[PDB]
Amino acid sequence: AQKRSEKQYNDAQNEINKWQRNAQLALQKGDENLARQALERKKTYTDTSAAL
Amino acid sequence: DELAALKAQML
């Protein structure tokens, strides 16, 4: 179970990293929506990660 | 968040 939680935690961390890459892409793109989505997703994930 | 986004958009 501990290993499973770690894997889930790792996935959340990976998702945040993926979102960060998207955010970098968003800045070049200049689209407000893409940047906003990444920031919101990162915050909830961080809270979830803390709980995990 | 919007203010932060605007700075990012400037790139």
Swiss-Prot record, chain B:
Polymerizes to form rings, filaments and ribbons. Rings are formed by stacked rungs that tilt to give a dome-shaped curvature. Rings form with symmetries ranging from C11 (55 subunits) to C17 (119 subunits). It comes from the Bacteria. It is found in: Cell inner membrane. Belongs to the PspA/Vipp/IM30 family. A helical hairpin is formed by residues 25-137 which is conserved in all known ESCRT-III proteins. Helix 5N-5C (residues 193-217) contacts the helical hairpin 3 subunits away and is essential for oligomerization. The C-terminal flexible linker and alpha-helix 6 (residues 220-256) are not required for oligomerization and do not resolve in electron microscopy. This is Membrane-associated protein Vipp1. It comes from Nostoc punctiforme (strain ATCC 29133 / PCC 73102). Coiled coil: none annotated. A membrane remodeling protein capable of forming rings and/or filaments on membranes, which then curve and tubulate the bilayer. Rings will form on liposomes, altering their positive curvature so the lipid bilayer is remodeled into a negative curve as the membrane enters the ring. Ring stacks of varying lengths can be seen joining isolated liposomes. A lipid monolayer can be drawn into the center of the rings. Required for thylakoid formation.
